[PDB]
Design an enzyme around this catalytic site. Structure first.
Site, PDB file in Angstrom:
ATOM      1  N   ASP A 167       8.915   9.031  -3.171  1.00  0.00           N
ATOM      2  CA  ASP A 167       9.959   8.252  -2.539  1.00  0.00           C
ATOM      3  C   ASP A 167       9.730   6.783  -2.881  1.00  0.00           C
ATOM      4  OD1 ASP A 167      10.960  10.541  -1.331  1.00  0.00           O
ATOM      5  OD2 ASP A 167       9.870  10.184   0.553  1.00  0.00           O
ATOM      6  N   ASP A 168       8.472   6.345  -2.928  1.00  0.00           N
ATOM      7  CA  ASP A 168       8.233   4.921  -3.235  1.00  0.00           C
ATOM      8  C   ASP A 168       8.873   4.514  -4.562  1.00  0.00           C
ATOM      9  OD1 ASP A 168       6.722   4.909  -0.923  1.00  0.00           O
ATOM     10  OD2 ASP A 168       4.781   4.740  -1.967  1.00  0.00           O
ATOM     11  N   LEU A 198       6.786   2.970   1.269  1.00  0.00           N
ATOM     12  CA  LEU A 198       7.792   1.942   1.354  1.00  0.00           C
ATOM     13  C   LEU A 198       8.960   2.180   2.298  1.00  0.00           C
ATOM     14  CD1 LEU A 198       7.991   0.915  -2.454  1.00  0.00           C
ATOM     15  CD2 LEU A 198       6.365   0.151  -0.712  1.00  0.00           C
ATOM     16  N   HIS A 199       9.320   1.134   3.038  1.00  0.00           N
ATOM     17  CA  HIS A 199      10.461   1.176   3.951  1.00  0.00           C
ATOM     18  C   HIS A 199      11.255  -0.124   3.763  1.00  0.00           C
ATOM     19  CE1 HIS A 199       8.229  -1.709   6.257  1.00  0.00           C
ATOM     20  NE2 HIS A 199       7.269  -0.838   6.512  1.00  0.00           N
ATOM     21  N   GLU A 200      12.277  -0.352   4.589  1.00  0.00           N
ATOM     22  CA  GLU A 200      13.125  -1.547   4.439  1.00  0.00           C
ATOM     23  C   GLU A 200      12.415  -2.882   4.567  1.00  0.00           C
ATOM     24  OE1 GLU A 200      16.839  -2.698   4.226  1.00  0.00           O
ATOM     25  OE2 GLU A 200      16.434  -1.196   2.677  1.00  0.00           O
ATOM     26  N   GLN A 204      12.653   4.464  -4.523  1.00  0.00           N
ATOM     27  CA  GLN A 204      13.155   3.257  -3.878  1.00  0.00           C
ATOM     28  C   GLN A 204      13.064   2.065  -4.809  1.00  0.00           C
ATOM     29  OE1 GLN A 204      12.584   2.684   0.485  1.00  0.00           O
ATOM     30  NE2 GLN A 204      11.029   4.278   0.217  1.00  0.00           N
ATOM     31  N   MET A 255       0.885  -1.169   0.000  1.00  0.00           N
ATOM     32  CA  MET A 255       0.000   0.000   0.000  1.00  0.00           C
ATOM     33  C   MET A 255       0.927   1.224   0.000  1.00  0.00           C
ATOM     34  SD  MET A 255      -3.501  -0.855   1.874  1.00  0.00           S
ATOM     35  CE  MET A 255      -3.064  -0.571   3.500  1.00  0.00           C
ATOM     36  N   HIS A 263       9.476  -3.559   3.292  1.00  0.00           N
ATOM     37  CA  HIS A 263       8.972  -3.828   1.943  1.00  0.00           C
ATOM     38  C   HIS A 263      10.104  -4.208   1.022  1.00  0.00           C
ATOM     39  CE1 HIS A 263       6.011  -0.764   3.445  1.00  0.00           C
ATOM     40  NE2 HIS A 263       5.211  -1.762   3.108  1.00  0.00           N
ATOM     41  N   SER A 307       7.513  -0.574  10.252  1.00  0.00           N
ATOM     42  CA  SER A 307       6.131  -0.331   9.852  1.00  0.00           C
ATOM     43  C   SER A 307       5.980   1.104   9.377  1.00  0.00           C
ATOM     44  CB  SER A 307       5.211  -0.507  11.057  1.00  0.00           C
ATOM     45  OG  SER A 307       3.907  -0.086  10.738  1.00  0.00           O
ATOM     46  N   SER A 308       5.077   1.328   8.433  1.00  0.00           N
ATOM     47  CA  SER A 308       4.829   2.675   7.926  1.00  0.00           C
ATOM     48  C   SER A 308       4.195   3.499   9.049  1.00  0.00           C
ATOM     49  CB  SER A 308       3.872   2.625   6.727  1.00  0.00           C
ATOM     50  OG  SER A 308       2.640   2.014   7.085  1.00  0.00           O
ATOM     51  N   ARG A 309       3.735   2.828  10.099  1.00  0.00           N
ATOM     52  CA  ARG A 309       3.110   3.551  11.210  1.00  0.00           C
ATOM     53  C   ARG A 309       4.104   4.016  12.274  1.00  0.00           C
ATOM     54  NH1 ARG A 309      -2.511   0.582  13.217  1.00  0.00           N
ATOM     55  NH2 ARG A 309      -3.748   0.932  11.313  1.00  0.00           N
ATOM     56  N   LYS A 348       5.380  -9.939   9.293  1.00  0.00           N
ATOM     57  CA  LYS A 348       4.951  -8.847  10.171  1.00  0.00           C
ATOM     58  C   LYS A 348       3.431  -8.887  10.361  1.00  0.00           C
ATOM     59  CE  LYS A 348       5.169  -4.387  11.757  1.00  0.00           C
ATOM     60  NZ  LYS A 348       3.742  -4.471  12.129  1.00  0.00           N
TER      61      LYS A 348
HETATM   62  C1  LIG Z   1      -1.713  -7.026   1.142  1.00  0.00           C
HETATM   63  C2  LIG Z   1      -2.118  -5.543   0.928  1.00  0.00           C
HETATM   64  C3  LIG Z   1      -1.158  -4.861  -0.072  1.00  0.00           C
HETATM   65  C4  LIG Z   1      -3.544  -5.514   0.392  1.00  0.00           C
HETATM   66  O1  LIG Z   1      -3.970  -4.166   0.240  1.00  0.00           O
HETATM   67  C5  LIG Z   1      -2.202  -4.760   2.332  1.00  0.00           C
HETATM   68  O2  LIG Z   1      -3.123  -5.438   3.241  1.00  0.00           O
HETATM   69  C6  LIG Z   1      -0.825  -4.625   3.037  1.00  0.00           C
HETATM   70  O3  LIG Z   1      -0.433  -5.568   3.847  1.00  0.00           O
HETATM   71  O4  LIG Z   1       0.137  -3.415   2.885  1.00  0.00           O
HETATM   72  P1  LIG Z   1       1.558  -2.899   3.408  1.00  0.00           P
HETATM   73  O5  LIG Z   1       1.381  -2.352   4.741  1.00  0.00           O
HETATM   74  O6  LIG Z   1       2.043  -1.945   2.331  1.00  0.00           O
HETATM   75  O7  LIG Z   1       2.588  -4.178   3.561  1.00  0.00           O
HETATM   76  C7  LIG Z   1       2.827  -4.624   2.411  1.00  0.00           C
HETATM   77  C8  LIG Z   1       3.591  -5.977   2.655  1.00  0.00           C
HETATM   78  O8  LIG Z   1       4.923  -5.763   3.253  1.00  0.00           O
HETATM   79  C9  LIG Z   1       5.019  -6.544   4.453  1.00  0.00           C
HETATM   80  N1  LIG Z   1       5.736  -5.858   5.515  1.00  0.00           N
HETATM   81  C10 LIG Z   1       5.456  -4.666   6.185  1.00  0.00           C
HETATM   82  N2  LIG Z   1       6.282  -4.293   7.114  1.00  0.00           N
HETATM   83  C11 LIG Z   1       7.231  -5.333   7.079  1.00  0.00           C
HETATM   84  C12 LIG Z   1       8.424  -5.604   7.820  1.00  0.00           C
HETATM   85  N3  LIG Z   1       8.868  -4.803   8.791  1.00  0.00           N
HETATM   86  N4  LIG Z   1       9.163  -6.791   7.504  1.00  0.00           N
HETATM   87  C13 LIG Z   1       8.749  -7.659   6.521  1.00  0.00           C
HETATM   88  N5  LIG Z   1       7.604  -7.487   5.752  1.00  0.00           N
HETATM   89  C14 LIG Z   1       6.894  -6.299   6.086  1.00  0.00           C
HETATM   90  C15 LIG Z   1       3.579  -6.757   4.899  1.00  0.00           C
HETATM   91  O9  LIG Z   1       3.412  -7.776   5.892  1.00  0.00           O
HETATM   92  C16 LIG Z   1       2.877  -6.961   3.614  1.00  0.00           C
HETATM   93  O10 LIG Z   1       3.053  -8.254   3.090  1.00  0.00           O
END
Ligand SMILES: CC(C)(CO)[C@@H](O)C(=O)OP(=O)(O)OC[C@H]1O[C@@H](n2cnc3c(N)ncnc32)[C@H](O)[C@@H]1O
Ligand SMILES: CC(C)(CO)[C@@H](O)C(=O)OP(=O)(O)OC[C@H]1O[C@@H](n2cnc3c(N)ncnc32)[C@H](O)[C@@H]1O
Lengths: 287, 286
Positions: free
Chosen positions: B86-87, B41-43, B90, B38, B45, B194-196, B158
């Site tokens: 930025d997405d 993007l961070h590390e 990356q 979604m 992803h 996390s993006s949060r 995650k």
């Molecule tokens: C599946 C989606 C795209 C459907 O809209 C949506 O529900 C979604 O999940 O979005 P999103 O939050 O963008 O996460 C996208 C994917 O990256 C993974 N991810 C996130 N943070 C991570 C981390 N620190 N280490 C490893 N993997 C990580 C998530 O578990 C997910 O599979």
């Protein structure tokens, strides 16, 4: 290793993985995979779909035979559904079909009912009135058959028009890469839509049953005079028949949306004769 | 086929365009890898991207779509972080060749019509107070899989419950795709990326280390049993300033209708201010 496949012969597979492997191997060899979903107990209505699939150049026809428990109601009688395995396969052989997929309930639902498809609101109307969970069962099994077989085209009869429309919605909504082909309803000589249920009607009921098709065809020709005239003509014919309990008679657009006052539409009827529910529908051009 | 420049980032918004390119690629022998995100993007992803890129002969498609269906009204959809530029920068640095960035109208031209109804797991943990969240996730993932038709699809551990539900989707609908789970990427102190995390002020960021510390403490305490594991995590969480636990549960790895027996997953969700953080870890009992 890919399971054996003998061209020009009826090859029967019960394991989803086997038909998936053969289907994939065949599409790579220059064939276009046609899928004809059925619940067996085949008659000429089902064979019309088979013939439509067979005529596509390069076709390999896959006919699935699976009585899907999910589309039967809490009151639907699954165990009572007709099962004539041997005769079905004999008809497919006579038709030149090369693949029959005959899985068990356990093979299709190894984890029971878990992830399922939830249809749009059309599934709660018309046939969904008395059977509110019916179409979820249909769409769920069709989606699975489509993923297992991965056909180029899938064939459905206009007999179950609402089912056909809901499958087109499934395909559009889930971005499925398959062409949905609707096949015209096969009818008995007097117009009655062919169905295994027709044999349950006694003589008086079988004669009265002609009113469904006669009402629809009358309406189709009365339509030059407008929607209301088409509807009134159909009701008049149904009203001239004894023991025919009409559950609905509705004129809708071709995608089953609101009744149009001009243009193309579909008129659908369902009625009960004794304990047997019969359905029919027809294309209507208003004006 | 729309224009495709190999070795460069190709961005497509139309479902039809990416579907045509993916098909053409698969027809020529390349294996298509899908990484749904979604954005923002961070590390974490990027680890999914790198996992995908390492598959021999692969072409990677990263979808970026803030899926409205998985949000419940309440300003959450509008508040989701969006950092488009930025997405893509990356993705370019990672050597990704395709970014699929569809519009809401292209994905939901008919609103919510046919949808995916997940199994019972969707009503638990994250789904408890957000009953329609996973139906939103599974419906969009099913669509993305049908549009791109990848050989493998990558998800992070995650969001472990999401990963499990996606395996259920794939098995239950007989989807011809391999689901690859990728280990959680963490900051140096253990905080799951996390993006949060961008919503944690300095104080909250410091206190947030408690989630990973609690889980790792539990993973080691587990030699002494489930109660020991859970109490160790609870002690760490209770010692943390400003951390309000939503849930801390130890389940069988499938999170299903099976009791914990040997291999499990410990999951935690907690709020630091208005920011809800999640983390989870593999646990072996005794
Ligand atoms: C599946 C989606 C795209 C459907 O809209 C949506 O529900 C979604 O999940 O979005 P999103 O939050 O963008 O996460 C996208 C994917 O990256 C993974 N991810 C996130 N943070 C991570 C981390 N620190 N280490 C490893 N993997 C990580 C998530 O578990 C997910 O599979
Ligand atoms: C799609 C299924 C297989 C899912 O379980 C199930 O819902 C099902 O519909 O099975 P079934 O009742 O076996 O019908 C299988 C297919 O044959 C078509 N058909 C039946 N009678 C017909 C007739 N008189 N003229 C033209 N086509 C006719 C149906 O509309 C359907 O597409």
């Amino acid at each position: 290793a890919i399971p054996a496949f003998h061209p020009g012969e009826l090859n029967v597979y019960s394991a989803p993985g086997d038909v998936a492997d053969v289907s994939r191997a065949l599409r790579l060899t220059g064939r276009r995979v046609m899928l004809v979903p059925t619940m067996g107990a085949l008659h000429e209505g089902h064979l019309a779909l088979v013939r439509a699939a067979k005529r596509v150049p390069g076709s390999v026809v896959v006919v699935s035979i699976f009585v899907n428990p999910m589309q039967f109601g809490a009151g639907g009688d699954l165990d009572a559904y007709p099962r004539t395995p041997d005769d079905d396969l004999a008809q497919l052989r006579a038709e030149g079909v090369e693949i029959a997929f005959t899985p068990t309930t356990a093979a299709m639902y190894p984890d029971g009912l878990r992830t399922t498809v939830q249809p749009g609101p059309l599934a709660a109307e018309l046939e969904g009135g008395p059977r509110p969970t019916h179409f979820a069962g249909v769409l769920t099994v069709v989606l699975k058959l489509l993923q297992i077989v991965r056909p180029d085209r899938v064939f459905f009869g206009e007999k179950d028009y609402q089912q056909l429309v809901l499958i087109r919605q499934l395909v559009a909504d889930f971005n499925l890469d398959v062409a949905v082909v609707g096949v015209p309803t096969v009818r008995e000589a007097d117009g009655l839509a062919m169905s295994s249920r027709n044999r349950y009607l006694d003589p008086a009921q079988r004669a009265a049953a002609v009113a469904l098709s006669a009402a629809l065809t009358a309406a189709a020709h009365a339509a030059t005079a407008g929607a209301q005239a088409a509807l009134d003509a159909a009701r008049a014919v149904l009203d001239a028949a004894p023991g025919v309990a009409v559950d609905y008679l509705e004129l809708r657009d071709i995608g089953l949306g609101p009744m149009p006052l001009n243009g193309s539409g579909r008129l659908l009827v369902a009625a009960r004769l004794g304990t047997t529910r019969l359905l029919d529908n027809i294309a209507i051009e208003i004006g």
